[PDB]
UniProtKB/Swiss-Prot annotation, chain B:
UniProt function note: The normal physiological role of the enzyme is unknown, but it is not essential for the viability of yeast cells. Has aminopeptidase activity, shortening substrate peptides sequentially by 1 amino acid. Has bleomycin hydrolase activity, which can protect the cell from the toxic effects of bleomycin. Has homocysteine-thiolactonase activity, protecting the cell against homocysteine toxicity. Acts as a repressor in the GAL4 regulatory system, but this does not require either the peptidase or nucleic acid-binding activities.
Post-translational modification: The N-terminus of isoform Cytoplasmic is blocked.
Subunit and partners: Homohexamer. Binds to nucleic acids. Binds single-stranded DNA and RNA with higher affinity than double-stranded DNA.
Family membership: Belongs to the peptidase C1 family.
Protein name in the entry: Cysteine proteinase 1, mitochondrial
Residues of the full protein shown: 131 to 366 of 483
Comment field (misc): Present with 521 molecules/cell in log phase SD medium.
Amino acid sequence: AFQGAMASSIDISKINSWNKEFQSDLTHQLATTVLKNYNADDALLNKTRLQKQDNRVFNTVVSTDSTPVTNQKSSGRAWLFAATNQLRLNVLSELNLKEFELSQAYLFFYDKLEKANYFLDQIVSSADQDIDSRLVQYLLAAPTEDGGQYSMFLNLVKKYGLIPKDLYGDLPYSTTASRKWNSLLTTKLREFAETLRTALKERSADDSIIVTLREQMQREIFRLMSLFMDIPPVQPNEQFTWEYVDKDKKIHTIKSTPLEFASKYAKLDPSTPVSLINDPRHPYGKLIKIDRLGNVLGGDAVIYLNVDNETLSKLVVKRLQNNKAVFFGSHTPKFMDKKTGVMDIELWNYPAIGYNLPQQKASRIRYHESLMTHAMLITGCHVDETSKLPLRYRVENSWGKDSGKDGLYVMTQKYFEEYCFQIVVDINELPKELASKFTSGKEEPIVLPIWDPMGALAK
Amino acid sequence: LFFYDKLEKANYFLDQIVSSADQDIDSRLVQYLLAAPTEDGGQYSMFLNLVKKYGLIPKDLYGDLPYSTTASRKWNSLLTTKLREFAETLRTALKERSADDSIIVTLREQMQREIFRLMSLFMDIPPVQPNEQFTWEYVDKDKKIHTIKSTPLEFASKYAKLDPSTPVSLINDPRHPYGKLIKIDRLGNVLGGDAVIYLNVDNETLSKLVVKRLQNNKAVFFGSHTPKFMDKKTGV
Amino acid sequence: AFQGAMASSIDISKINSWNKEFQSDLTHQLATTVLKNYNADDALLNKTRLQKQDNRVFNTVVSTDSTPVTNQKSSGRAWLFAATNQLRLNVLSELNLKEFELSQAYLFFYDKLEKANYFLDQIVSSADQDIDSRLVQYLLAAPTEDGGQYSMFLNLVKKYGLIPKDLYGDLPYSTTASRKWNSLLTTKLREFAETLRTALKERSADDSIIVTLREQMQREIFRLMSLFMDIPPVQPNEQFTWEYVDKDKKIHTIKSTPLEFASKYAKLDPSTPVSLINDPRHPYGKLIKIDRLGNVLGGDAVIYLNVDNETLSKLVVKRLQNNKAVFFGSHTPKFMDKKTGVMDIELWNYPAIGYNLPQQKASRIRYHESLMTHAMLITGCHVDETSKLPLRYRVENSWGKDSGKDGLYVMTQKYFEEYCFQIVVDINELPKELASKFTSGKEEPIVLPIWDPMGALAK
């Protein structure tokens, strides 16, 4: 009781005695001098290591270049940029373009509208639960947040298609500085959540009253959205004409629909991509499903196939050899030097100040230390001729051409293994044993709560 | 106050993890403990907890010179990654043994030492202990030099005029009846220090209290939802 | 022979073996990581020490404040600023002024003109020596350099007096960026040196030809000077009227001459100040004279009375207690943190990287490591009540009000002892035993060459 509390307390004599002992060590005296002056990462950056790790030679790359480098600015749209950065290469090459971008804003507008609507439904389906329950508070936390993942991306493309950024871009203030717009919509959605819950205490979900109430809510949400961004110029099955110049200065015009463009030009068949994760807390070969997570009401559920790093790595090299970039999620900006664009777990000399981290990946995830926070694109890698295994990956980020080295980053194999959690591949690129997990009798997915670390969204 | 608050919070977290070891790792409480154990924020009871144990001193003897006082994010990240490792080490060991078991007792102390070690790298432990004398020389408005020899605990009282036994925190939380005491479960910084207790009061009473304090020449500490409806440019 | 040369060479295996051994040390691993990232002084600044050393409480200060802080800008005029900063306090107090400055530019113009002229004479008196001799090359190195010392200051004041900066200030470009003006004058002076030497091979010093030649040289020098700065508006014995406002907003007018002003208002009696140095290479109580050093042809020779630190320190405290600032020279910017304005030998944690410096003061001077390079003003100090000895000094620098803490610096007693070399006092402030060294039968000064470290000038 008292003795334990006493022994577990911070004792002043004790800490001062420990101080006396630490100060007698020269490494300690030096470390405390430096660490009071500069940020630990600035102080500890290891140029001996950087000299070797900052290597931009990649023997296995996709043929088409990422031009121009994209910039999401102050928004959490990385997943949208990485997904479109992957597909835009198909247009760039096919139509012989110097620079091309698919509309990231197009997807952004519909994703936010769908999420706001999705939230209302989530509130209706959880109305029976207490207001301070974990689920209801979690629904109320960030209903219109920008972040997402690949299934949420296919949900939008299935319904809305894709179009050239030339027809709808980042002109609006809110595409590049979304925080305030999100705040405004969310304060309103929180009001709506209470209006809905109060009404549901009295009536049932379907009751003209509730049905009418929801539609008005949906209209008001659309109203406020249209103030910050315009609804796209064409509907999904509506034709648009897009005029452009190719590399040889020849002018062309394409008349298409957003849904036809996604397929015909962007080469996306929404039926083939699958998301694979490396979550050591669960057995590999299993399907993981994130409960309640989504954007489009009734769209595809977030399902992942848990796979080991050795398989993920082979899939990545295989895709690149087949001239296809690879969307991947990671824990940004852990062990990432934005100035040089290097992603390396050992780039900083933390061991020199006696700072080591034994906690393994599964535990880091369990213990709230690591999860996916950003999505980027692997556009190349270097397979060691002797080991015949990849040492590093060429990463295309969406932070402008001044981030890293001309917008590009280099990631070590070890960083991919420890601080990345998912890649997106086509079901046909998988070994039949893995593909069947998706095609056969479901397999029965491990179902995780929405607040589970693996349900995190890439921003 | 900052140095001791962070050290006490890191230590406090270890205890919180020990007292919740029987709960699942993805439970709401355990995940909440693991979220921001060394975060800078606080409230008045946590402030009195530090002053009771550590007193107060002139900034002249210990200020914001260290990088981490003015840019604390990285220091907090480093300490927290380590604390999350410690939480698992402790929980794993507690599956086997009981809270008091030399093994656990030893384990905790080493954890506490390592935490103090990493802290002393980013900030120095203050120059004097709470009951240890310091001399502070200063100049008044008329250019006269003076020296004060005091202890941090005597200074808090003698000069700063703080009697840690009189202040109370009042809140206006319309979700609850007024005139009631509200207590926040598990919230703290100093292991075994005062619990966070609030007296729920209406706006009309709070407003009178504020005017009354000001008329009695005393400023008033208050908490708010910053930066809602706040224009920083004009300060409105 | 060969073996010695071999043993004294840098051996590659050896240095790589030493590298292997140093890298196994944690303090070394940490030090090399940090030192490849930041300047050693930035990395090693010791905030634990700074926290204590940055102390601006001084129990023994001169009553009048230094307003405004002065700024020499890009010129080596520190000695002129420190000397006038000392005297301006007399005017500030006597005439009840909020802000006052004596003309630093006034002294500057005449010092440069006198130095250029002085050089011609030096070249004439050394014409018999070889062109690559140490003396002749030393004369040709920086004949019009801005730097100086106190005797050179009294030389100008004796001949030119002093005036209010209001009548002649730093308006010209060359007062605040003197390098180019000095370059131009010096290229011309080097031409003149050869013209003179060539002519002196034929004729004697006095020979109408040489006499005429010199005067034309002097005229051309004055000509080029007047292009970059104007000759002051009044001659030394010529009256000027100066109108000013005191602190109570009352207007006043003073009609005076530069020579009368120096005495009457600035309170300078050119006959009382003497320069004391602490040069451990020589016995204390001795007079040291710097051969050939000067500015005004035939003016006072540079003579110093060598005194120990204990005596210098007492003299400094005594002057301050008597409400008089103290001009001093030091090795700027050794162990000087301009950002904080702290002058402390131990402010940086060099011992933490195993970097220690045992060489003592006399040896540092002998070995080309330390000498006076800058002059500043001590305007206060703090005498420890218990030891009854000074711990720190309040220093007024001439680098603008943003240098240090509002233009002011704080110097430790130890810094004064190790990195300062001279102070200026009045002969009557000295102990009679020391005063007589100046007044009595000369004493016979130790004569040092012009290139001797103690002949260095404060810039």
